[PDB]
Amino acid sequence: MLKKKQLTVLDLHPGAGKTRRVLPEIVREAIKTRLRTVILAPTRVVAAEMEEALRGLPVRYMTTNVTHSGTEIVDLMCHATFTSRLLQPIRVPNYNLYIMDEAHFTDPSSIAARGYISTRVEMGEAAAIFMTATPPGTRDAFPDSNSPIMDTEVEVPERAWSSGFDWVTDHSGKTVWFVPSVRNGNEIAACLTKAGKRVIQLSRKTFETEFQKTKHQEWDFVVTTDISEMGANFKADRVIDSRRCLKPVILDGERVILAGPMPVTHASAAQRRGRIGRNPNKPGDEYLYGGGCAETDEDHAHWLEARMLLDNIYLQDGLIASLYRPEADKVAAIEGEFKLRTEQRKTFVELMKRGDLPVWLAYQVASAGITYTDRRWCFDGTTNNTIMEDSVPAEVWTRHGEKRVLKPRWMDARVCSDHAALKSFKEFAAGKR
Ligand SMILES: Nc1ncnc2c1ncn2[C@@H]1O[C@H](COP(=O)(O)OP(=O)(O)O)[C@@H](O)[C@H]1O
Ligand SMILES: [Mn+2]
């Protein structure tokens, strides 16, 4: 059963073998029946794990080993690559079958991809399989696992501590710890180091290049933000979960703020817990969690950002894809209201890719008719848009040979929320990329 007008949700529990056992079964059938197929991985790390599982099968990897093949049937790329080529003039094949792994990923690109795909199925042109243990709207934070898990609600620290949390360091196994922000992770990683622990810190931006150290290095703690929910694999016996995240929120339609950490969805909680309990020979991995879950995530900027991407993907004349139905009421918008014309869309795409700016911010710049390399907007905003570093106004040497205070016309706190984010924006403002 692969060629019909239907979207299948494959929702086996974490570790049941969606990526390693089921996926190759589908690819083999799609190859056999000559079905133009795309496989969508959330990250390059998952893409490499798919390659091990798919070795032997004719798959065209559109990901950074590629050897020429006369078989053109199954493509594999990241969610974000898929959506990006759909925004670009580059021609994306009209696949008969879409296979989305980790189809709960809530990056705006993944959300937009699911909207595009569900619209193609809804119109009779394709089939689709969404692989995820935690489909949108699940209220089960404690699904089944391969091995029994010990769940404990505790007070989870979010700052350095002197006393009160001895159970954290009095543990000899390996721990994955989900923190509410990169800054909080830094402060916690320094406390754990002080106590004689070996700590690796991961975030979404560093995940691709630094996750590999968790396999070629000795560690006691992985201190990380929510990137590791989707398909990160550690050999850990314990997960510590604050169950909270900073959330980017559009305030008064004019700016994005990072709103003070707010509980995660049951799906996120389930996915974090799902990093352990995966080995049937090891009962009693521990899931220690800091608070409750909430499904009130409509204030997250990524729902509107997904509409901004989807308004810019052509399907047929006068038709704009809707969000995947379980995600469609998360955002109030006018369909098409973010559609840019051809040259501004180009700028939008390039501000998001080489510029490395959040979708919301790239949209403000592109739709103002600013070209990609014109950085005068990073300095000409209102004084409440002044970016601080070490409690003083940040400054850069501009491409016009002047020292200017960083003061963007549109303010998005995600570009100055941590040291790495701000360094990156400072180089963008100076014209260095
Ligand atoms: N490199 C590996 N070698 C052997 N077993 C693995 C490896 N990676 C994962 N597994 C195990 O295979 C099972 C299925 O994993 P996976 O297909 O990723 O599950 P799912 O996609 O359903 O979350 C899990 O028990 C996992 O621990
Ligand atoms: Mn998987």
The CA R_g of the chain, rounded to the nearest whole Å, is 22
Q: Which ligand is nearest to the CA of 14?
A: 1
Rounded to whole angstroms, the maximal C-alpha distance in the chain is 64
> Resolution of the coordinates in A?
2.0
User: How many angstroms separate the CA atoms of 281 and 173, rounded?
Assistant: 15
Measure Cα distances from 198 to 158, 213, 273 in Å.
18, 12, 22
Asked if 42 and 101 touch (Cβ cutoff 8 Å), the reply is yes
Annotate 265-279 with DSSP letters as a single string. PHHHHHHHHTTSS--
Give me the domains of the chain, ranges plus CATH numbers. Answer: 1-138+297-334 (3.40.50.300), 139-245+261-296 (3.40.50.300), 246-260+335-433 (no CATH)
Return the C-alpha torsion angle 23, 28, 32, 36, nearest 10.
40
For residue 103, which of 279, 267, 269 has the smallest C-alpha distance?
267
Experimental technique behind these coordinates: X-ray
Q: Please report the atom of ligand 1 found closest to the CA of residue 16.
A: 22
User: How many angstroms separate the CA atoms of 349 and 372, rounded?
Assistant: 10
Q: How many CB atoms lie within 10 A of CB 354?
A: 11
Length of the chain: 433
Q: How far is the CA of 145 from the centre of ligand 1 (A)?
A: 12
Cβ neighbours of residue 412 closer than 8 Å, sequence gap 6 or more: 248, 255, 256, 357, 358, 360, 361
- At 367, which amino acid appears? S
| Atom 8 of ligand 1, nearest CA residue | 233
Q: How many CB atoms lie within 10 A of CB 231?
A: 23
Listed residues: CB within 5 A of ion ligand 2 = 18-19
Q: How far is the CA of 283 from the centre of ligand 1 (A)?
A: 16
Q: Please report the atom of ligand 1 found closest to the CA of residue 13.
A: 22
Residue reference for tokens 């204030």: 299
| Atom 11 of ligand 1, nearest CA residue | 15
User: How many angstroms separate the CA atoms of 327 and 346, rounded?
Assistant: 27
The residue to mutate among 55, 101, 271, 278, having the most atoms of ligand 1 within 8 angstroms of its beta carbon, is: 278
Q: Which ligand is nearest to the CA of 25?
A: 1
Query: Phi/psi class of residue 17: alpha, beta or left (left: φ > 0; alpha: ψ in -120 to 50)?
Result: left
Q: How far is the CA of 101 from the centre of ligand 2 (A)?
A: 7
- What letters, b where the CB count within 10 A reaches 16 and e where it falls short, cover 313-351? beeeeeebbbbbeebeebbeeeeeebbbeeebbbbbbbb
